[PDB]
Amino acid sequence: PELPEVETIRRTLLPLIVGKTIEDVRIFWPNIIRHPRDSEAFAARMIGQTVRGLERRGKFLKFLLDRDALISHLRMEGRYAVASALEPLEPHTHVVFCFTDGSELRYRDVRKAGTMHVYAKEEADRRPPLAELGPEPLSPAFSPAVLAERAVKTKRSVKALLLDCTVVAGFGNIYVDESLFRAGILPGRPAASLSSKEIERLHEEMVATIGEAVMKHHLYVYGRQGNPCKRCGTPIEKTVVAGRGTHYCPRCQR
DNA sequence: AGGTAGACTCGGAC
DNA sequence: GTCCGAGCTA
Ligand SMILES: [Zn+2]
């Protein structure tokens, strides 16, 4: 799930778990648990705590309990569901939180790629994976000025810059390529080569692209290689940039 | 020094 | 066999 989906999850999941008290925690793929590194300590500390809230930071979900916060990343295929403890688990279910009312919060992930970290609430924001996370792309904290400062101080490509979680929180590959197409900037351009207007435009397209998705095939380049650009008809091309599949129109983007 | 490329994980798809 | 990709180590 990308950031917009994660926000949808935060919004829809919260009412389904708020005020519920954890009675048990079951872990079927320990590698998901990153802190405490010992999945036994992770499970034990959460028992007896009541879910008080659910927040989002980038693509991380932050479950707020009585004393602790649980920080979760779903990567590409992770998903949460609330269901009855009486029903069989779905395939690829790796972590289950059991509530005192007979319902369960279940985490599924065919790729087993997601992560979970638990800390005292007051520490969560100053430990991984949240520590050093950059500003929310839809917050005033992420401004053109902030982007410009990071761009001028690096040799990397502009795509690499946007992919950096310390620059902006949870801005996914699809949104990077779409934002760059919409801003008319080739992904392989050196970040420091971007003019003031280009940074202004890129920031604007970033906020609009991810903002529009948060509010909600309407894609210009991502996954469209070999197909005509929707704006100029030039075949969309795909190469590797910053170690990622990168889609662009060689005519629209400069 | 500290920014940077690299390595690393998973399994569905070729 | 090789490909893919989000966010500790030289
Ligand atoms: Zn085009």
Phi, psi of A246, deg, nearest 5: -135, 125
The answer to whether A54 touches A10, Cβ cutoff 8 Å, is yes
Q: Following CA atoms A104, A107, A108, A113 in sequence, which dihedral angle do they give, to the nearest 10 degrees? A: -170
Contact A96, A43 (CB under 8 A): no
* Residues A180, A181, A183: CA angle, nearest 5 degrees: 60
A62 is catalytic: no
Which among A137, A102, A114, A134 has a CA at the least distance from the CA of A61?
A114
Residue with the two structure tokens 């924001």: A125
| Contact criterion met (CB below 8 Å) for A116 and A38 | no
**Span A1-132 CATH architecture:** Alpha-Beta Barrel (3.20)
Binding residues of A, as ranges, are 92, 111, 229, 232, 249, 252
Which one-letter amino acid corresponds to residue A109?
Answer: D
As a rounded value in angstroms, the CA-to-C1' distance for A180 and C2 is 29
Annotated catalytic, A244? yes
For tokens 């590194």, what's the residue? A37
Q: Would you identify the CATH topology of the domain A133-254?
A: Helicase, Ruva Protein; domain 3 (1.10.8)
Resolution in Å equals 1.9
| Contact between A81 and A108 (Cβ < 8 Å) | yes
Q: How was this structure determined?
A: X-ray
Residue A212 makes CB contacts below 8 A (sequence gap 6+) with: none
- Cα(A233) to centroid(ligand 1), Å: 6
CA dist., res. A186 & res. A152, Å (int): 17
- Catalytic member of A10, A59, A108, A182: A59
Q: How many CA atoms lie within 13 A of A136 on its CB side?
A: 13
Got the DSSP string for A38-76? SHHHHHHHHTTPBP-EEEEETTEEEEE-SSEEEEEE-TT
CB–CB of A147/A135 below 8 Å? no
Q: Tokens representing A28?
A: 């079927």
The whole-angstrom separation of Cα A34 and Cα A44 is 15
- What is the rounded CA–CA span in Å between residue A200 and residue A220? 20
Give whole-number Cα distances, A253 to A131, A154, A172, in Å: 34, 21, 19
- Show which residues sit with Cβ under 7 A of nucleic chain C: A 58-60, 73, 75-76, 111, 113, 128-129, 163, 165, 170, 172-173, 240, 243-245
Residue A237 contacts residue A250 (beta carbons within 8 Å): yes
CA atoms of A105 and A103, how far apart (whole Å) = 7
Q: How many CA atoms lie within 13 A of A100 on its CB side?
A: 12
**Residue A108 bears catalytic tag:** no
A177 to each of A142, A146, A163, A183, A191, how far by Cα in Å? 19, 20, 10, 10, 14
Joined together, the tokens standing for residue A6 give 């994660």
As a dihedral over the C-alpha atoms of residue A52, residue A117, residue A209, residue A1, rounded to 10 degrees, the angle is: -100
Identical fold between A1-132 and A133-254: no
Q: Which nucleotide in the DNA or RNA is closest to residue A129, CA to C1'?
A: C7
User: A38: which 2 tokens?
Assistant: 């010992």
Which secondary structure element, helix H or strand E, spans residue A81, and what is its range?
strand A79-84
CA of A170 to the centre of ligand 1 (A): 26
Tokens representing residue A16 in the block: 């389904």
Read off the amino acid at residue A123: E
> Could you give the maximum distance between any two Cα atoms of chain A, in Å?
59
**What is the domain partition of chain A in residue ranges?**
1-132, 133-254
Q: Rounded distance, CA A203 to CA A21, Å?
A: 42
Give the count of beta carbons closer than 10 Å to the beta carbon of residue A95: 26
Catalytic residue, candidates A36, A244, A250, A251: A244
**From the CA of A159, how many Å to the C1' of B8?**
22
